[PDB]
Structure 1
Amino acid sequence: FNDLSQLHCSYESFDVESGVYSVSSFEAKPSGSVVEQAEGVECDFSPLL
């Protein structure tokens, strides 16, 4: 549900001491993709067709 739930389950108790605690850092969503490098030559399939 939230970070405090993970912090409670990290100590295996309903009671934890006060203070600063490191918690799971989140990640921003990717904005897209890029697909480009040196190609443009077709592979040979003429004797196959």
Structure 2
Amino acid sequence: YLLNFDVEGYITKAVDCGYDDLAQLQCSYQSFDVETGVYSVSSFEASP
């Protein structure tokens, strides 16, 4: 999960990293605010 803490220490919002591709981009940058662009993200998982 990506967690945002306020000044008092509470968790105010979060991102589930494995929900979709945008959530993965946000978790990679450790940020809720990403710049406009074209990014490469984690490939589709291949398991036996």
Q: What's the TM-score, normalizing by structure 2?
A: 0.49
Normalised TM-score (structure 1): 0.48
Q: Which structure has the larger Rg over C-alpha atoms?
A: 1
Compare the two structures and name the one with the higher strand fraction. 2
